[PDB]
Each structure stands twice: as structure tokens, then as C-alpha cells.
Nucleic acid binder design. Structure first.
Length: 67
RNA sequence: UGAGCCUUGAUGUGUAGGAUAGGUGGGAGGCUUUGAAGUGUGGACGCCAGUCUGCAUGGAGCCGACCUUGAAAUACCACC
């Protein structure tokens, strides 16, 4: 399920990874694939930290960052 | 008396609208006998039309893509 969403003026961007039906390793590899496909287009005018904190969550989850 | 931090909140009428349209992960039923819609009343907000909570009442429904619409739900959890 390819997804293409846009960032806001503040710079907080998140896209779909899938429902809770996907298991842990699939979720982690999807996160890794999205992370690498996002960092591969790191612009030179993005000086500083590129990925700061991801607020991943579910229907009864809370936004916590990961590695 | 200035400055900051994990957390909980309050405010989000471009005009096309039931009317005070930020959006994203989740998302087409969450939430409500771990008591929801309707009443008198207090403070916050706002584009003086209107939103949230305390108090007592009621104690079982406002809300859905609802009809429109550039962006959809404040149907629900977290972010800013």
C-alpha cells in the first residue's frame, strides 16, 4: 500500500504504515523502509537533525519515538 | 517579578455549510450503567452567531462520509 502525503508548515510529517494486522517485524521493516526512502532525499537546506521524533500510535496508543 | 521543562486542558466561521472548516498515525463507529442527549447557572474563547467544564436536574444519546464543500469532522485516542 503505497502512500504519498505532504508535510505542514511546522514540519511534522507522518504517513500510513498499515493497520494493527501487521506483526512486529513487518511494522519495523516498513518503518525502516519509509525512513530510508525519506532520508535518501535529504536536502542540503535541511541543516541540523533531519528526523527528530516520530509520534507513532494506534487506536489506543501514544506517540513515542524509536531508534 | 522574567526564562524553561514530561503531563493534562481551553480557542480555532476564507465563501460554497445543520455551524466558529488547521491537519496528520490511526481511521466508518468511537464514547456514554468505570452513567450519554435535553434544563437553571459559573468561568475560559470567539468573526457577539456560538464551543468545553464545575454545581443541581435528567439519568440513555449529540454526533458519520451526514446536505454543501479547496481542505472533515472537535465520531474517538496522540502530536503540533
Amino acid at each position: 500500500g503505497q502512500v504519498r502525503y505532504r508535510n505542514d508548515k511546522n514540519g511534522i510529517i507522518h504517513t500510513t504504515i498499515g493497520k494493527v494486522d501487521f506483526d512486529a517485524d513487518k511494522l519495523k521493516e516498513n518503518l525502516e523502509a519509509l525512513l530510508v526512502a525519506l532520508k535518501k532525499a535529504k536536502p542540503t537546506q535541511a541543516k541540523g537533525v533531519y528526523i527528530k521524533k516520530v509520534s507513532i500510535s494506534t487506536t489506543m496508543g501514544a506517540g513515542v519515538a524509536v531508534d
